[PDB]
Write a protein that binds this DNA or RNA. Structure first.
Length: 90
DNA sequence: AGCAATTTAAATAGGGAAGATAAGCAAAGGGTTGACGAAAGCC
């Protein structure tokens, strides 16, 4: 259900980012997505308040299914449609 | 009240034994370190 967990994400909060200061201080909430470093093995990250979200009825939330087997590059190129592309880019 | 000599050669070989064992217990703790966001009195 990788379309559902995206409207979920975005509603709860949703900030995909490949760089943050939350790894330094948890009081941070600064999130920037760099466009120019997305590669085939680039593992993207995400944040929602209290890390909220729903699983895919297999035990995995948005983060592990988006990190597994280059699915972020799959959506970012557009191999899973352009209706997931604009949601992921927004 | 200091003087004490020089060279020369220092053993070749053969042996350093294997057989055994090398414990089984039972313990190895949890106590703090939660931010964001939302009710709810309060200037």
């Amino acid at each position: 259900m990788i379309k559902e967990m995206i409207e979920d994400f975005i509603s709860k909060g949703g900030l995909i980012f490949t760089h943050s200061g939350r790894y330094t201080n948890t009081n941070n909430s600064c999130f920037i997505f760099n466009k120019n470093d997305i590669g085939v093995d680039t593992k993207v990250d995400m944040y929602t308040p209290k890390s909220a979200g729903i699983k895919n009825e297999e035990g995995e939330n948005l983060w592990q299914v988006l990190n597994k087997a280059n699915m972020f590059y799959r959506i970012y190129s557009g191999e899973l449609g352009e209706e997931l592309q604009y949601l992921l880019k927004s």
